[PDB]
A = this chain, B = another copy of it.
Amino acid sequence: GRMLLDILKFLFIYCLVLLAFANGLNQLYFYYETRAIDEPNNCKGIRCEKQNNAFSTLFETLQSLFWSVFGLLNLYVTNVKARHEFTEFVGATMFGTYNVISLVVLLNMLIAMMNNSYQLIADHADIEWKFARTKLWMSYFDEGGTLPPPFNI
């Protein structure tokens, strides 16, 4: 719980990064939206068997760059039907630098950040723990002992 507040200072910067690359990839691939009828099983976007239009809208692009932190996108995502090899290559390099920044740089900087925070937290532990244990204990000293299992009414 004392390291979560140090993660939340970092997710703002990472969300700043997602915003950046979603702005770029939406700007590059918004010309290539296809209707849902044109793909098999009448399915559009990611969460399809055929990952078809991920960088089409801004919400689907934010989603797309979210799911690529884990190994859940594919390289056939960055293609278009129109076979434009320069824009598909530039989009794949934008997706590659997102993968380097988000997965190699920022994730391991978050690891080092939580090492240095966990070393500072783990000294003041067992008096930080006992304060919360006395708050939990001292919440049950009061007169209101009626049970929330509906006996409370």
Shortest distance from the beta carbon of A52 to any chain B beta carbon, whole Å = 11
Q: Which residue on chain B has the smallest CB distance to residue A78? A: B47
Would B70 and A72 count as touching, CB distance under 8 A? no
Tally chain A residues at the interface, Cβ within 8 Å: 44
- Residues from chain B with a CB closer than 8 A to the CB of A116 are 115, 118-119, 122
A interface: dominant SS: helix
- Interface stretch of the complex, out of A25-33, A104-112, A129-137, A139-147: A104-112
A20 at the interface (CB under 8 A from B): no
How many copies of this chain are found per oligomer? 4
A5 at the interface (CB under 8 A from B): no
A61 at the interface (CB under 8 A from B): no
- Residues from chain B with a CB closer than 8 A to the CB of A43 are 79
Q: Mask for A68-97, Cβ within 8 A of B = 1, else 0?
A: 011111111011000100001000100010
Given contacts A76-B48, A116-B122, contact A108 B111 (CB under 8 A): yes
Would B114 and A118 count as touching, CB distance under 8 A? no
- Residues from chain B with a CB closer than 8 A to the CB of A73 are 72
Shortest distance from the beta carbon of A13 to any chain B beta carbon, whole Å = 11
The 6 closest A-B pairs by CB, nearest first: A71-B71, A112-B118, A112-B114, A47-B75, A49-B76, A112-B115
